[PDB]
Design a protein around this ligand. Structure first.
Ligand SMILES: *[C@H]1O[C@H](CO)[C@@H](O)[C@H](O)[C@@H]1O
Length: 36
């Protein structure tokens, strides 16, 4: 479960793209997305 400030789901990330409750996967860069 991706936590706040962690990379939730950008290109290159094949891991679990689900953020912890309270946060949303905010894609900033195409490869860097962060749970906010
Ligand atoms: C999940 O992890 C983030 C850091 O990656 C923390 O800021 C958050 O409070 C939670 O422990």
């Amino acid at each position: 479960t991706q936590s706040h400030a962690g990379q939730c789901g950008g290109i290159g990330y094949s891991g679990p793209t689900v953020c912890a409750s309270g946060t949303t996967c905010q894609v900033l860069n195409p490869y860097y997305s962060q749970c906010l």
